[PDB]
User: Fold this.
Amino acid sequence: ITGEGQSAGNITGDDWDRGDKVTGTEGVSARKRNPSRAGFMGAMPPVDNKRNDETEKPDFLITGSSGNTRDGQLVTFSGGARG
Amino acid sequence: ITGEGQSAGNITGDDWDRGDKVTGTEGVSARK
Amino acid sequence: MGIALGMIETRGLVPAIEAADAMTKAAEVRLIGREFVGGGYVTVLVRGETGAVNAAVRAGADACERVGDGLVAAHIIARPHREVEPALGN
Amino acid sequence: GIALGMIETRGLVPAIEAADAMTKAAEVRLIGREFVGGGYVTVLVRGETGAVNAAVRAGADACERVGDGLVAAHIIARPHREVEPAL
Amino acid sequence: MGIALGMIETRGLVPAIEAADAMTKAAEVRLIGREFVGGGYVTVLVRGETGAVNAAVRAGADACERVGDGLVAAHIIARPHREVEPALGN
Amino acid sequence: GIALGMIETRGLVPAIEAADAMTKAAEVRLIGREFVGGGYVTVLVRGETGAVNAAVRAGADACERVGDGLVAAHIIARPHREVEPAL
Amino acid sequence: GIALGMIETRGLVPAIEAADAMTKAAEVRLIGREFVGGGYVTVLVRGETGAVNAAVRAGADACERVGDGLVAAHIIARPHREVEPAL
Amino acid sequence: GIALGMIETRGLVPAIEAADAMTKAAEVRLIGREFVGGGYVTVLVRGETGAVNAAVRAGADACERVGDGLVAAHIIARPHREVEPAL
Amino acid sequence: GIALGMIETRGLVPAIEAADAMTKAAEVRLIGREFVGGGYVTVLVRGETGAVNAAVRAGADACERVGDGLVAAHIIARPHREVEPAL
Amino acid sequence: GIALGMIETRGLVPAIEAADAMTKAAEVRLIGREFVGGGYVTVLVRGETGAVNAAVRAGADACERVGDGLVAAHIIARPHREVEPAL
Amino acid sequence: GIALGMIETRGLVPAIEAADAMTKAAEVRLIGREFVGGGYVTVLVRGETGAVNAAVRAGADACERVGDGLVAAHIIARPHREVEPAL
Amino acid sequence: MGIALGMIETRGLVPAIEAADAMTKAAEVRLIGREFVGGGYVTVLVRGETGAVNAAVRAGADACERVGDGLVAAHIIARPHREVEPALGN
Amino acid sequence: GIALGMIETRGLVPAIEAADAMTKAAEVRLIGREFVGGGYVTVLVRGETGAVNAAVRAGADACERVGDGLVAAHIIARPHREVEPAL
Amino acid sequence: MLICKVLKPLVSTNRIPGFEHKHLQVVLDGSSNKVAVDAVGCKPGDWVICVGSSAAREAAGSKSYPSDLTIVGIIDHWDP
Amino acid sequence: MLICKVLKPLVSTNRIPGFEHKHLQVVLDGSSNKVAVDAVGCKPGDWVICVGSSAAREAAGSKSYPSDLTIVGIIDHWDP
Amino acid sequence: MLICKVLKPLVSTNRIPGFEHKHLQVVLDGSSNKVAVDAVGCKPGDWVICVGSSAAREAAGSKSYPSDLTIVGIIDHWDP
Assistant:
């Protein structure tokens, strides 16, 4: 149904691929084929975003962290405590 | 208690230094 | 030859031949069978390319149901098996 | 292959880009590049049934977002023997 | 030799090969690849003509959604170019 | 035999439990122990239709509660030869 | 210069303005001006991808504010072999 | 014995501390560590069935909080010889 | 020349759709396809800067819808020679 | 010294910086730098009991603030004689 | 260049962008690209402290806004003798 | 020779040497320095192995808080580097 | 070279912690330790500008918590030669 | 303002604000090369006049516009 | 704009706003040396184009940005 | 940016905004003399880098700051 825009081109005039109706072998009562099983009960695994913690403030730049501003470890009072 | 992060590393899993309990000579009734 | 199979079954052959006309008017499909099931059921087999057969069956299911008693049973077969060919006139 | 694929639109960027998708998606021979007048421009390509099918899929899906948009997307698996004398 | 490349990926090999069997049964096409993308993404790669590829992928989508965690992507390519061919294992 | 039975599960422990139930539930040879990635593990057994059917049902309904749980349980009976690359 | 661009608008005040910008921007060749009919005018340009891109963007933004302005404008990087029939 | 005990964890440090509990609780020798993928880690210990059961009990009771925690830890006292290729 | 176009996506259906856009919209060489893991599928092409730009825009607006669609996409014009041995 | 120190984390900056603290704090030999998959990376160092103790102190206290953070910090004073064959 | 930096992210659009900036910024040597698994990609760089600092900051802030961006980035000024095992 | 440097500073020499005696009694370690920082800051510097240093500093913290104005800083170093060694009076 | 890193703190426990960071994180020479009086303890090191920057950042984020922590911290890149005899 | 003989056109590249840069043209002021945005006409170039500084910004169309020199006019009778 | 052949890279130093300075690169305009922020590509450098003035500020990313010259583009066909 | 070898220091005079001018230093760009505010280090001077234009203002500390050129960094490996 996703492919490359199968149903996107639905303005197409007269003759078309797909299955408007009475088109047995397109998975309707057909795809069931080999009996699969559901089980699971919980779907997708609970993947956690490794990025977390945060809490405190990153250690005074110069070791990691993007964006931001402050100073190139200038002699300014900031220097170490640049924050 | 301050040192260099003695209790900061408290996620440390199984075996550890320190004094969870019944550890007489760590100053409890000892340091006096 | 395109192995894609279209087949349409109707009560009476007037809708069957309407379906066959939709077949031979829509796409590159050749009717490979016109058979009388028994007791009035008439059905038609055409063969051709997958998209061609799909469009033809679409046209038949658009122009067949309201003709007399009308369409009773249609479908498409995409990639028919080799062993089915004996049942298809061999 | 005698299948005909057709697109109408308002302008030439839609027409030319739709034709580029037409020919890139699958093997189809462009036969007609006709300026109707009044802003209508049409492209007609020739190819087999599945090729024209997928190619006009791609052509519409590339052309939809140009100008006022594609006006008509339409194909025939095989036109009659008597249509092409007035192609 | 049907150059049209149909292919679909899903969660685990149960839905993947069920879709593969659906494609090779409903349509007479040749699958060329089974790939492990990683993290559950497993992909089946089949070659055939445009109509046969269309029928095969429709069947795979029909028979793959109701098994496992289901299908994810179900789009095809009608006329793959030569340069993609090395990416298919040349 | 030509019948293929095959299952995923999240976690290798339920996978080997299911394959263990495969290999004692019915006369069957197992051919595949595949690590899908991200935790999906797939077991591939080969045998005749009745044996694979019974074995898969037994392993699935015994492995439902084992560990994290199963994924899918439907089985094909007469696989096409074209699944040879799955070997 | 296989890379192809084209500027289409309503009336050719913006069309000739955009074509002037086209030729003004790079070593591009104007291969054809076409009267669509109904007021649309199209101007074709050929060259390499970067030069064509610069020209088309310059002309489009220059002509969007003159008179009634552009209608649409995009670029074809790898035009098909049917370009010769298209011109 | 011939029993094979299994442990599964979210990550390998809990898995192998559980394996330490395995080999340090009872007379059981671990035959393998396997990274399933996506973080799932299993350890496979081999030994006497009672020893295996006691060891698994100890490890599971030890490793609930270690790392992110356990996933699966069940045992078969008689895994098939057919499981040996998977071992 | 050395212009580096590249696409990341989730599931390789959009990856190869973008590759098709690469090879059909522009004339560039496809230098790599990499399975990062975790679902990331990456395509790597080299060619002319403007041609690569046309290729990447086509790949984006083609494969951004299919399945999970593209995840990240940007162009590299003149990559450092030191980077090349790593690719 | 047969004491093992272990850290799991999400990424390599946490892993490499934690290992640098590992080795800077005291004399410990890094033995394992293992990529679990799914984002999990682990470091295993070898040293005596007090050295591993203080070293893993420093490693956690240097690594806590990188990425999503350290996942598991764990050490053993002496693993069993039977663990290292699967180190 | 004993001084070591490394850029780690999710997917390698930002990874190769950051590595391009790395090599782009100074006379630094890219010693290794590693696929973590689960989508994380790491790029190592060696050089002196100032050059490595400039490169890492440039690449990090450049890649924070591309695609899904960086995850973390810091520098090692005096890497331990275990760097050779680490690579 | 336990290279691990434990050391703690406090308000005046009463708590300082009480902590020193606690370290040298609860643990068998060798203190190497008594320093007057200035303004009441007086520091004791002891060498030992990591476990012995840990026990000594725990004892010093336990026995030093309840005397004088009390302890202030109670952190240690496990593996001091060679370059710090001259700062210890070489 | 002459790059002057230096730290002030209250109580010398953080002073020597920062000195440990100096000597372990970077390769610089420790030129002085001064007892100002009033609790101020100062460490003075010389080395390479980038190396000194890494050293001072490590010293700051290491000793800022211990006891009273650091009080003032800044870097000097190229101190005047006249200053040197006073130190 | 800078007297300036148009020399040649340019080519696009990997900058974003080119939406307003509008086909930069290499020009010459009699000493060396230069490039300025073509506002009205460049041709091969006989003699045109070029404006820079901050005026260039509002000379090109926007206060925030990124330029240092814009051509502003054409001298019909030119100058030797 | 200033035609400019990239020459070499730079090294960091003790300034604070380097968070946005983004790896300055020494370039040459044919007469002497210069340095400008690399926005898109420097390489050894065949021929790129450099923008300064106040435009440089918004050419580099910010109105308050401290620059006098930023490279803005690459000329594919370059110039002798 | 302007490559610049520090030459000598300056002396105060009868201007009011010197509160922020912060010890101007005569530098040389290889051709003639110049003077720029020392932000971080001048020494006798091996090779440092100097930034001017309006960036200089925010390079020196204030939008309203009166400067045309500020030294911004030091090149450790310098250049012949």
Notes: Strands of chain J lie at 3-10, 29-37, 40-47, 70-76.
